[PDB]
Design a protein around this ligand. Sequence first.
Ligand SMILES: CC(C)[C@@H](OC(=O)[C@@H](NC(=O)CCC[C@H](N)C(=O)O)C(=O)S)C(=O)O
Ligand SMILES: [Fe+2]
Length: 329
Amino acid sequence: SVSKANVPKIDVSPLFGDDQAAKMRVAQQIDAASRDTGFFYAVNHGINVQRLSQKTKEFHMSITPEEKWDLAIRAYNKEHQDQVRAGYYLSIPGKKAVESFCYLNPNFTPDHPRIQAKTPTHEVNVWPDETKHPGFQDFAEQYYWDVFGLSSALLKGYALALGKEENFFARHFKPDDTLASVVLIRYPYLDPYPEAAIKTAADGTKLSFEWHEDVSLITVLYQSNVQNLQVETAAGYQDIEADDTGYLINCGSYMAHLTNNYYKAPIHRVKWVNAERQSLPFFVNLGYDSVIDPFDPREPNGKSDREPLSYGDYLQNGLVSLINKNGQT
Ligand SMILES: CC(C)[C@@H](OC(=O)[C@@H](NC(=O)CCC[C@H](N)C(=O)O)C(=O)S)C(=O)O
Ligand SMILES: [Fe+2]
Protein backbone atom coordinates (compact mmCIF):
# COMPACT_ATOMS: atom_id res chain seq x y z
CA SER A 1 0.00 0.00 0.00
CA VAL A 2 0.82 3.70 -0.21
CA SER A 3 1.46 5.55 3.08
CA LYS A 4 -0.80 8.41 4.25
CA ALA A 5 0.69 11.86 3.64
CA ASN A 6 1.00 14.22 6.60
CA VAL A 7 -1.66 16.85 5.84
CA PRO A 8 -2.42 18.81 9.00
CA LYS A 9 -5.74 20.55 9.69
CA ILE A 10 -5.04 24.24 10.49
CA ASP A 11 -7.72 26.49 12.04
CA VAL A 12 -7.26 29.64 9.92
CA SER A 13 -9.96 31.71 11.69
CA PRO A 14 -7.43 34.00 13.45
CA LEU A 15 -6.28 35.26 10.00
CA PHE A 16 -9.64 37.05 9.60
CA GLY A 17 -9.25 38.93 12.91
CA ASP A 18 -6.99 41.35 14.78
CA ASP A 19 -5.16 39.10 17.29
CA GLN A 20 -1.58 39.41 15.95
CA ALA A 21 -0.07 36.76 18.28
CA ALA A 22 -2.79 34.28 17.28
CA LYS A 23 -2.04 35.05 13.62
CA MET A 24 1.67 34.25 14.19
CA ARG A 25 0.78 30.84 15.67
CA VAL A 26 -1.26 30.10 12.52
CA ALA A 27 1.66 31.31 10.35
CA GLN A 28 3.99 28.84 12.10
CA GLN A 29 1.65 25.96 11.23
CA ILE A 30 1.59 27.12 7.59
CA ASP A 31 5.42 27.30 7.64
CA ALA A 32 5.71 23.74 9.01
CA ALA A 33 3.28 22.29 6.48
CA SER A 34 4.94 24.19 3.59
CA ARG A 35 8.37 22.80 4.59
CA ASP A 36 7.03 19.22 4.99
CA THR A 37 4.66 17.68 2.42
CA GLY A 38 3.51 21.06 1.09
CA PHE A 39 -0.21 20.45 1.80
CA PHE A 40 -2.56 21.35 4.64
CA TYR A 41 -6.33 21.55 5.20
CA ALA A 42 -7.66 25.02 6.12
CA VAL A 43 -10.55 24.52 8.59
CA ASN A 44 -12.88 27.09 10.26
CA HIS A 45 -12.68 29.00 6.97
CA GLY A 46 -16.23 30.40 7.04
CA ILE A 47 -17.34 29.27 3.57
CA ASN A 48 -20.54 27.26 3.06
CA VAL A 49 -18.99 24.39 1.05
CA GLN A 50 -22.10 22.18 1.23
CA ARG A 51 -24.09 24.90 -0.60
CA LEU A 52 -21.20 25.35 -3.09
CA SER A 53 -21.33 21.58 -3.81
CA GLN A 54 -25.14 21.61 -4.16
CA LYS A 55 -25.20 24.58 -6.56
CA THR A 56 -22.32 23.06 -8.58
CA LYS A 57 -24.13 19.68 -8.76
CA GLU A 58 -27.34 21.39 -9.97
CA PHE A 59 -25.29 23.05 -12.76
CA HIS A 60 -23.27 19.96 -13.84
CA MET A 61 -26.27 17.62 -13.95
CA SER A 62 -28.59 20.01 -15.86
CA ILE A 63 -26.27 21.51 -18.50
CA THR A 64 -26.95 20.03 -21.93
CA PRO A 65 -24.69 19.15 -24.87
CA GLU A 66 -26.08 22.17 -26.78
CA GLU A 67 -25.10 24.56 -23.98
CA LYS A 68 -21.60 23.03 -23.69
CA TRP A 69 -20.84 23.80 -27.37
CA ASP A 70 -22.28 27.31 -26.94
CA LEU A 71 -19.99 27.96 -23.94
CA ALA A 72 -16.93 26.02 -25.16
CA ILE A 73 -13.35 27.29 -25.06
CA ARG A 74 -11.49 27.58 -28.38
CA ALA A 75 -9.79 24.16 -27.97
CA TYR A 76 -13.26 22.62 -28.57
CA ASN A 77 -14.97 25.35 -30.65
CA LYS A 78 -13.04 27.33 -33.26
CA GLU A 79 -15.77 30.02 -33.39
CA HIS A 80 -14.71 31.19 -29.90
CA GLN A 81 -11.20 32.56 -30.49
CA ASP A 82 -11.36 34.93 -27.46
CA GLN A 83 -12.06 32.01 -25.07
CA VAL A 84 -8.70 30.52 -24.07
CA ARG A 85 -9.29 30.20 -20.31
CA ALA A 86 -12.97 30.92 -19.56
CA GLY A 87 -15.84 28.64 -20.58
CA TYR A 88 -16.72 24.96 -20.95
CA TYR A 89 -14.09 22.21 -21.31
CA LEU A 90 -15.91 19.21 -22.85
CA SER A 91 -15.54 15.52 -22.13
CA ILE A 92 -14.99 13.13 -25.06
CA PRO A 93 -17.03 9.96 -24.33
CA GLY A 94 -14.85 6.87 -24.76
CA LYS A 95 -11.65 8.98 -24.58
CA LYS A 96 -11.68 11.79 -21.99
CA ALA A 97 -13.86 11.50 -18.91
CA VAL A 98 -13.44 14.81 -17.10
CA GLU A 99 -15.33 17.98 -18.03
CA SER A 100 -15.35 21.43 -16.42
CA PHE A 101 -16.39 25.07 -16.45
CA CYS A 102 -13.83 27.83 -15.74
CA TYR A 103 -14.56 31.46 -14.89
CA LEU A 104 -12.32 34.43 -14.08
CA ASN A 105 -12.65 37.72 -12.20
CA PRO A 106 -16.24 39.03 -12.53
CA ASN A 107 -14.73 42.57 -12.79
CA PHE A 108 -13.26 41.65 -16.20
CA THR A 109 -16.15 43.36 -18.02
CA PRO A 110 -16.16 44.71 -21.60
CA ASP A 111 -15.08 48.18 -20.35
CA HIS A 112 -12.18 46.94 -18.15
CA PRO A 113 -8.89 48.50 -19.29
CA ARG A 114 -7.16 45.11 -19.72
CA ILE A 115 -10.09 43.73 -21.75
CA GLN A 116 -10.00 46.87 -23.95
CA ALA A 117 -6.23 46.38 -24.51
CA LYS A 118 -6.76 42.65 -25.22
CA THR A 119 -4.00 41.77 -22.73
CA PRO A 120 -3.26 38.02 -22.67
CA THR A 121 -4.88 35.96 -19.87
CA HIS A 122 -7.76 38.46 -19.36
CA GLU A 123 -11.19 37.45 -20.71
CA VAL A 124 -14.85 38.32 -20.13
CA ASN A 125 -16.68 35.37 -18.54
CA VAL A 126 -19.29 33.41 -20.48
CA TRP A 127 -22.44 32.11 -18.69
CA PRO A 128 -25.34 29.78 -19.53
CA ASP A 129 -28.85 31.22 -20.01
CA GLU A 130 -30.39 32.56 -16.78
CA THR A 131 -33.78 30.91 -17.43
CA LYS A 132 -32.15 27.47 -17.85
CA HIS A 133 -29.85 27.88 -14.81
CA PRO A 134 -31.67 30.23 -12.43
CA GLY A 135 -29.37 31.87 -9.90
CA PHE A 136 -26.21 30.08 -11.13
CA GLN A 137 -24.26 33.13 -12.40
CA ASP A 138 -25.11 35.12 -9.24
CA PHE A 139 -24.11 32.21 -6.99
CA ALA A 140 -20.86 31.60 -8.92
CA GLU A 141 -19.83 35.30 -8.86
CA GLN A 142 -20.54 35.50 -5.11
CA TYR A 143 -18.50 32.28 -4.63
CA TYR A 144 -15.55 33.96 -6.39
CA TRP A 145 -15.66 36.75 -3.80
CA ASP A 146 -16.12 34.35 -0.83
CA VAL A 147 -13.04 32.28 -1.86
CA PHE A 148 -11.11 35.49 -2.74
CA GLY A 149 -11.74 36.59 0.89
CA LEU A 150 -10.46 33.26 2.29
CA SER A 151 -7.44 33.41 -0.07
CA SER A 152 -6.57 36.94 1.09
CA ALA A 153 -6.59 35.70 4.72
CA LEU A 154 -4.40 32.69 3.76
CA LEU A 155 -1.95 35.04 1.97
CA LYS A 156 -1.60 37.06 5.20
CA GLY A 157 -0.67 33.76 6.91
CA TYR A 158 1.96 32.89 4.24
CA ALA A 159 3.45 36.41 4.40
CA LEU A 160 3.80 36.21 8.20
CA ALA A 161 5.24 32.67 7.85
CA LEU A 162 8.04 34.00 5.58
CA GLY A 163 9.02 36.80 7.98
CA LYS A 164 7.20 39.54 6.03
CA GLU A 165 4.43 42.05 6.91
CA GLU A 166 0.97 40.51 6.46
CA ASN A 167 0.12 42.42 3.25
CA PHE A 168 3.29 41.25 1.41
CA PHE A 169 1.35 39.06 -1.03
CA ALA A 170 -2.17 40.44 -0.42
CA ARG A 171 -1.31 43.96 -1.69
CA HIS A 172 -0.87 42.39 -5.19
CA PHE A 173 -4.14 40.37 -4.92
CA LYS A 174 -6.90 42.90 -5.66
CA PRO A 175 -10.51 42.64 -6.82
CA ASP A 176 -10.01 44.99 -9.78
CA ASP A 177 -7.24 42.99 -11.47
CA THR A 178 -6.62 39.52 -10.02
CA LEU A 179 -6.00 36.81 -12.63
CA ALA A 180 -7.43 34.18 -10.23
CA SER A 181 -9.73 31.50 -11.65
CA VAL A 182 -12.41 29.14 -10.34
CA VAL A 183 -12.76 25.74 -12.08
CA LEU A 184 -15.93 23.63 -11.53
CA ILE A 185 -14.68 20.13 -12.43
CA ARG A 186 -16.88 17.10 -12.85
CA TYR A 187 -15.31 13.61 -12.65
CA PRO A 188 -17.95 11.08 -13.74
CA TYR A 189 -18.90 7.57 -12.70
CA LEU A 190 -18.78 5.47 -15.93
CA ASP A 191 -19.74 1.81 -16.46
CA PRO A 192 -17.67 0.67 -18.55
CA TYR A 193 -14.89 3.21 -17.80
CA PRO A 194 -12.93 3.93 -21.00
CA GLU A 195 -9.33 2.67 -20.74
CA ALA A 196 -8.30 5.48 -23.12
CA ALA A 197 -9.40 7.93 -20.38
CA ILE A 198 -7.12 6.28 -17.78
CA LYS A 199 -3.39 7.10 -17.68
CA THR A 200 -0.77 4.84 -16.06
CA ALA A 201 2.12 6.16 -13.96
CA ALA A 202 5.64 4.68 -14.09
CA ASP A 203 4.86 2.88 -10.78
CA GLY A 204 1.67 1.34 -12.23
CA THR A 205 -0.83 3.63 -10.49
CA LYS A 206 -3.94 4.38 -12.57
CA LEU A 207 -4.37 8.16 -12.97
CA SER A 208 -6.78 10.79 -14.25
CA PHE A 209 -4.03 13.48 -14.35
CA GLU A 210 -0.25 13.10 -14.31
CA TRP A 211 2.40 14.54 -12.02
CA HIS A 212 2.80 18.31 -12.06
CA GLU A 213 3.44 21.44 -10.04
CA ASP A 214 0.60 24.00 -9.95
CA VAL A 215 0.61 27.21 -11.98
CA SER A 216 -0.40 29.53 -9.14
CA LEU A 217 0.85 31.46 -6.12
CA ILE A 218 -1.26 29.12 -3.93
CA THR A 219 -4.16 26.75 -4.79
CA VAL A 220 -7.31 26.70 -2.58
CA LEU A 221 -9.32 23.54 -3.30
CA TYR A 222 -12.67 22.08 -2.31
CA GLN A 223 -13.28 18.42 -3.29
CA SER A 224 -15.89 15.74 -2.63
CA ASN A 225 -15.15 13.18 0.11
CA VAL A 226 -13.55 10.62 -2.26
CA GLN A 227 -9.80 10.04 -1.83
CA ASN A 228 -7.80 10.70 -4.99
CA LEU A 229 -4.80 13.03 -4.68
CA GLN A 230 -1.20 11.90 -4.15
CA VAL A 231 1.88 13.94 -3.26
CA GLU A 232 5.49 13.00 -4.02
CA THR A 233 7.66 13.09 -0.90
CA ALA A 234 11.21 11.82 -0.23
CA ALA A 235 9.55 8.53 0.85
CA GLY A 236 7.58 8.24 -2.42
CA TYR A 237 4.04 9.11 -3.54
CA GLN A 238 1.71 9.32 -0.50
CA ASP A 239 -2.12 9.50 -0.38
CA ILE A 240 -3.72 12.83 0.65
CA GLU A 241 -6.84 12.03 2.69
CA ALA A 242 -10.12 13.57 1.57
CA ASP A 243 -11.91 16.14 3.76
CA ASP A 244 -15.04 17.67 2.23
CA THR A 245 -15.44 20.12 5.15
CA GLY A 246 -12.08 21.87 4.65
CA TYR A 247 -10.09 23.49 1.84
CA LEU A 248 -6.90 21.70 0.68
CA ILE A 249 -4.11 24.30 0.29
CA ASN A 250 -0.73 24.01 -1.48
CA CYS A 251 1.83 26.35 -3.07
CA GLY A 252 2.26 26.81 -6.83
CA SER A 253 5.52 27.40 -8.72
CA TYR A 254 5.33 31.23 -8.37
CA MET A 255 5.69 30.78 -4.58
CA ALA A 256 8.65 28.42 -5.15
CA HIS A 257 10.27 31.06 -7.40
CA LEU A 258 9.77 33.94 -4.93
CA THR A 259 11.06 31.94 -1.94
CA ASN A 260 13.98 30.27 -3.81
CA ASN A 261 12.38 26.86 -3.21
CA TYR A 262 12.07 27.34 0.59
CA TYR A 263 8.36 26.71 0.04
CA LYS A 264 8.45 24.20 -2.80
CA ALA A 265 5.54 23.70 -5.20
CA PRO A 266 4.77 20.07 -4.31
CA ILE A 267 4.63 17.56 -7.14
CA HIS A 268 1.25 15.81 -7.08
CA ARG A 269 -1.07 13.76 -9.26
CA VAL A 270 -4.71 12.67 -9.45
CA LYS A 271 -5.51 8.96 -9.14
CA TRP A 272 -8.18 7.42 -11.34
CA VAL A 273 -11.28 6.66 -9.25
CA ASN A 274 -14.55 5.42 -10.78
CA ALA A 275 -16.85 7.74 -8.85
CA GLU A 276 -19.13 10.71 -9.57
CA ARG A 277 -17.33 13.54 -7.79
CA GLN A 278 -16.42 17.22 -7.82
CA SER A 279 -13.12 19.08 -7.74
CA LEU A 280 -13.44 22.88 -7.33
CA PRO A 281 -10.05 24.66 -7.31
CA PHE A 282 -9.46 28.39 -6.92
CA PHE A 283 -6.04 29.27 -8.41
CA VAL A 284 -4.70 32.28 -6.53
CA ASN A 285 -3.07 34.43 -9.24
CA LEU A 286 -1.86 38.04 -8.83
CA GLY A 287 -2.29 40.93 -11.31
CA TYR A 288 -0.70 40.96 -14.79
CA ASP A 289 2.04 43.45 -13.85
CA SER A 290 2.58 42.17 -10.28
CA VAL A 291 6.28 41.61 -9.61
CA ILE A 292 7.52 40.48 -6.20
CA ASP A 293 11.33 40.56 -5.81
CA PRO A 294 12.59 37.03 -5.10
CA PHE A 295 14.15 36.40 -1.69
CA ASP A 296 15.51 33.51 0.41
CA PRO A 297 14.40 32.95 4.05
CA ARG A 298 17.25 30.45 4.59
CA GLU A 299 19.96 33.07 3.86
CA PRO A 300 21.08 35.72 6.37
CA ASN A 301 20.80 38.71 3.99
CA GLY A 302 17.65 37.20 2.44
CA LYS A 303 19.05 37.62 -1.11
CA SER A 304 18.35 35.25 -3.96
CA ASP A 305 20.06 34.56 -7.30
CA ARG A 306 16.70 34.46 -9.11
CA GLU A 307 15.48 37.28 -11.38
CA PRO A 308 12.15 39.08 -10.94
CA LEU A 309 9.33 37.61 -13.01
CA SER A 310 6.02 39.41 -13.63
CA TYR A 311 2.93 37.38 -12.75
CA GLY A 312 1.48 37.89 -16.25
CA ASP A 313 4.62 36.45 -17.88
CA TYR A 314 4.63 33.53 -15.44
CA LEU A 315 0.93 32.71 -15.95
CA GLN A 316 0.70 32.88 -19.76
CA ASN A 317 3.81 30.69 -20.11
CA GLY A 318 2.75 28.27 -17.33
CA LEU A 319 -0.77 27.48 -18.56
CA VAL A 320 0.51 26.61 -22.04
CA SER A 321 3.33 24.44 -20.64
CA LEU A 322 0.94 22.45 -18.41
CA ILE A 323 -1.34 21.74 -21.41
CA ASN A 324 1.69 20.61 -23.45
CA LYS A 325 2.92 18.34 -20.63
CA ASN A 326 -0.30 16.78 -19.30
CA GLY A 327 -2.82 17.41 -22.09
CA GLN A 328 -5.77 19.72 -22.76
CA THR A 329 -8.30 19.35 -19.92
C1 LIG B 1 -6.59 21.24 -8.72
C2 LIG B 1 -7.58 20.08 -8.91
C3 LIG B 1 -6.95 18.77 -8.39
C4 LIG B 1 -7.97 19.60 -10.32
O1 LIG B 1 -6.85 19.89 -11.21
C5 LIG B 1 -6.73 21.00 -11.95
O2 LIG B 1 -7.60 21.88 -11.96
C6 LIG B 1 -5.47 21.05 -12.83
N1 LIG B 1 -5.28 22.44 -13.24
C7 LIG B 1 -5.16 22.85 -14.51
O3 LIG B 1 -5.50 22.12 -15.45
C8 LIG B 1 -5.03 24.36 -14.66
C9 LIG B 1 -6.40 24.99 -14.97
C10 LIG B 1 -6.22 26.52 -15.16
C11 LIG B 1 -7.59 27.12 -15.53
N2 LIG B 1 -8.11 26.81 -16.88
C12 LIG B 1 -7.25 28.58 -15.78
O4 LIG B 1 -7.21 29.41 -16.96
O5 LIG B 1 -6.83 29.49 -14.73
C13 LIG B 1 -4.49 20.52 -11.85
O6 LIG B 1 -4.35 19.33 -11.75
S1 LIG B 1 -3.63 21.75 -10.89
C14 LIG B 1 -8.52 18.20 -10.62
O7 LIG B 1 -8.16 17.66 -11.69
O8 LIG B 1 -9.13 17.62 -9.69
FE1 LIG C 1 -2.57 20.50 -9.15
